[PDB]
Symmetry: C4
């Protein structure tokens, strides 16, 4: 593979149609899904020349750990959908690459098992109807050695994914939510209905600023709010004691018509003015895209779908190859842009084009 696009092709070949659709799709007309890509394509970097490149390093320090790249694996539920080794394959590859891996509330292998892989993992939290269950997950994650809580704040319920509805998508019997008894709703086949959306509408409670404070009081770990797009919500996240935010429209899967995170990133970085880490996701598909995000001010990016393409295509080895490719592309882009460090990349200027 010489690009991430090679991997999407490989994944489409192997995965069952309804599973590829569940992975690829967005909500509504998929306007926000497409806009994530369009928004990146419009950004051009103004590279610097003639700088010392004798020791280019792509490393960052974030949430108390050194990471090999300004990148982490995004939370993606139910990874056994894509390969039998699911989360274990991805976590092993991430560990070996020095990249943080985000363990999901709806992981198909238990959070303790995935944490046991090592690699100083993060944990993604959904707020559940039973608050105590969500707080218990936080404590389990901390006890297991997770280093940050990524609280997803953009899913009071799941968006309307028309591909999943048309397919009457449901989880196969062999894929379950391993962290708790989530019941059978996500496995029920109903015509024109997404079982996964039906399941979560029952299981999830809308999170509020009060929920954030409950989590912050329950752990010493940095709390990172994922799904922030409004400048005022980014400011409030800092005031609330968040250690970071992920500027994100959830891959175009939640509100159709939500602005891409990449379009809000610069304004958000200015408003928080170093008060927390500011990550971004949505459509990152190359090292050059990582560079663009960094130049707009991101601390790091998350990558979601491409990691699943790699997992579907070739399991752990596939994810390894994807991360090695991304690492090479990041080093390449940084050097060509005159940046010996990620901090230097954050000081690059950009220009919008057509």
């Amino acid at each position: 593979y010489v690009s991430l696009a090679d991997l999407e092709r490989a994944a489409r070949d192997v995965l069952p149609g309804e599973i590829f659709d569940f992975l690829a799709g967005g909500s509504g007309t998929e306007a926000s899904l497409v806009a994530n890509r369009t928004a990146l394509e419009r950004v051009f970097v103004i590279p610097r020349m003639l700088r010392d490149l004798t020791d280019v390093t792509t490393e960052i320090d974030i949430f108390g750990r050194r990471a090999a790249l300004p990148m982490a694996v995004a939370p993606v539920a139910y990874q056994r959908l894509f390969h039998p080794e699911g989360e274990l394959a991805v976590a092993r590859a991430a560990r070996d690459a020095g990249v943080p891996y985000t363990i999901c509330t709806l992981s198909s292998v238990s959070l303790e098992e995935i944490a046991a892989v090592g690699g100083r993992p993060w944990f993604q939290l959904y707020w559940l109807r039973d608050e105590k269950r969500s707080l218990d997950l936080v404590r389990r994650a901390e006890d297991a050695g997770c280093e940050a809580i990524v609280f997803t704040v953009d899913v009071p319920w799941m968006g309307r994914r028309l591909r999943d509805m048309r397919n009457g998508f449901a989880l196969p019997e062999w894929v379950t939510a391993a962290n708790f008894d989530a019941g059978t709703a996500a496995h029920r086949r109903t015509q024109g209905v997404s079982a996964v959306a039906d399941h979560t509408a029952r299981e999830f409670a809308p999170a509020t600023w009060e929920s954030v404070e409950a989590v912050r009081a329950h752990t010493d770990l940095p709390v990172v709010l994922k799904g922030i797009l409004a400048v005022e919500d980014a400011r409030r996240a800092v005031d609330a004691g968040a250690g970071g935010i992920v500027v994100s429209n959830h891959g175009g899967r939640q509100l159709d018509g939500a602005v891409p995170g990449i379009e809000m990133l610069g304004e958000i970085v200015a408003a928080v003015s170093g008060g927390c880490e500011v990550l971004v996701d949505g459509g990152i598909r190359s090292g050059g895209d990582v560079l663009k995000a960094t130049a707009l001010g991101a601390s790091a990016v998350l990558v979601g779908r491409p990691v699943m393409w790699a997992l579907a295509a070739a399991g752990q080895d596939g994810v390894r190859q994807l991360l090695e490719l991304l690492a090479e592309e990041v080093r390449d882009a940084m050097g060509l842009a005159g940046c010996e460090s990620v901090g230097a990349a954050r000081r690059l200027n950009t220009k919008l084009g057509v």
Copy 2:
């Protein structure tokens, strides 16, 4: 049906070509028709997170009544063109959904019959060559329980619809203007001529500000001016005593090259500064589009063509399904955007994209 687009497909299947064209088409090169869609597609919402969503309500109060959604059925003439039950089917579904229905001057079932369905209806007025006839329609509408007069101000005569001209479109014998003897002109088949345009050029008189005052003096009902695009005309509408305006280019069917209402809406909302209700129409095709209109400042939207798609596809039941779908999409979009009420949605910010 999982989207309004499903309904257009269904309607194209069933309707005769020239009737689908009469419904779908616009004037001239259809630039304004396309621009209504383009304009919405360029608007992105900046959603808010972490707000209380324990009682999301899509209701509004408008013209003295509670409506279930910030939406009404737009005036569409001659609904028997699309289904034998015509206006009665649509009005029944609107009533059951709690959505205002606009009864047309050129309805194919009498305004009194449609009003008898219930649901607190509005009445759309065209200014006719005989002024007394137009004022009599206003009084009939009020006597029948209509709750607002929607005075269409953008049709001094009908625009040039090339599809209708090429088709030599005329009304079938079984469709007539039930509110008065409109003569036979709209039924006459002439090559390269639209009988409907020929008919109205004879029957309609251009309305003026004097006509608005005559209507305002003739009724206690709120007068709503439909087809306002200039900021100064919106201001003047308030000064003239209008209870509302509909910012609209008449679905791209009148002046080809007229700006979309959605492009003028924000400026108009600022200029009237709460002095009347400001509605918008043109290309609303989802709950997310309703959200965009609200975020730009609209009090409510009108929906035209999709209601006729639903009527053509499955009669009253079709319209019911369309309104249930729109209601779900509106609730979904509002919640995902952090809005427990339509007032909160009006306070959302937006960003233009490409």
Copy 3:
């Protein structure tokens, strides 16, 4: 015919390929040709409502005569290329429609014959290597009753039209420059060479501000400079005593990459501040386009290619039908936009869209 586009289709059917190409084409990559259309398509009108339309008039006064529309037939050389009656057919139709007709220096019927048709014609001037010949043409035009001199200032030589070069285009033996002995160069067939471009490079001299003064001193008629795009050249035209200018890139046939006139029009109208008439051409293809040009501040437009489509399709009758269609579309657009006069249309606002 219900649109001008109908006529282009008709003309492509009948004309020989190389003649249609000579008519349709532009210079270079045809960027400016396409941009003339793109530029109009991006302009949207903000129409006014509720104004008195009891006597809509499309008439203007220009260069001392009343014209039926804010439009004239653009100068187009060698009209016998398109129909045997050539300029006489077009001039007769223009006269009957009350539209000024521009007689060309390179007309294929003598200027005196075309003037004898009546209709108070204009005369287009090219500056020739022998200055006395150009001034003699001016005097002939004035003696024959022409009412303005349209001095083309954007053809120091002909642009590079790749269609004409590839076709090895040359005039047929039966088409000649009837106003003087122009020699045989335009009739010579040479591979990969445009004989018309070769001919004019020999015959034409670049015009200068001194040439303008020589013309202004030679006639009492208003001198109109055609092909102005720079604001400073428009100002200078007023200072030089021009009665008008035509803001124009010569239909995309001269400098490839020249800005469309419609893009410079507003700025030019502001800069001249009523000091001369400001016309525009390039891509006017409907009454709505006329309205857009007027709203941007034009006194009138010229129309070129569509008049030749009509002439090729059906001779004098074809041109008559085209002008009747344009007249109807102009009246329609004006009324729908709330304008009872062309002066009111000039006060309309516009908005750029995508």
Copy 4:
């Protein structure tokens, strides 16, 4: 040939696939390659009229020599890839046309042989791992009569060209770096690897501002820094004693996502404020494009790929024809825009369009 596009067609016919790809391609997704063209297409010239054109001259003085056009042949490595006469054919044609030719560090014929052709050549420098070798090349170039050193500053290593990787591109045995023993790395065939990229990663050292000073101290010739895009790097180039810069993203072959030079040119010209020559390259494909670059403030342009198309198509004669065509297109564009000199063209204004 009537346009440069004719030549690309001819070249695609004759060249082996992997060689055409090596020539045509860019790095990554080829975003910057495409953007070079898009950026030029968006620029429109505002031409002037009525100026004296009795002696239009396309000549410039640059680096102490008169050039026939505001254009030079860009450095393109390994010209024997495209025709057996390689650099000698191109240099002879450039000499005969009065256009500077840039001899490459990686020329496939020795720099002394190419210089012996005459025509007052420039020399392009890459900084090599052995600094002394690079400085020796500078001295060789000066001794051989080269008139400027074009120091390429945007290749600390070669970008990721996916076409070359997929093709497993390597130089044929009959093409070598004639200026020094470059070893065998560029000739080694490895699957999924570009031998040329592998070769240069070993051979090249990243250049720094210290390298620029070492070169400036080693020669009396003007040093021109090629690959500057940041305004601050252009300013620093002047402060460093550069005689010129080439504003360039290396034809979209280095950082994918680098802004086009044409997008930075105006800002760069303003910032240097006459302190050095400012050239631009990337996508120049006509005399009209030369005019656009000049109007944005460039001293001259470089042309790369089209010169190789011409060389592949017809050797020395092909390059001659290309330069004659470009010369004619430049003269044509300048005159149509009212410019009797390149200095006048630099004073033209431009407007962005869509």
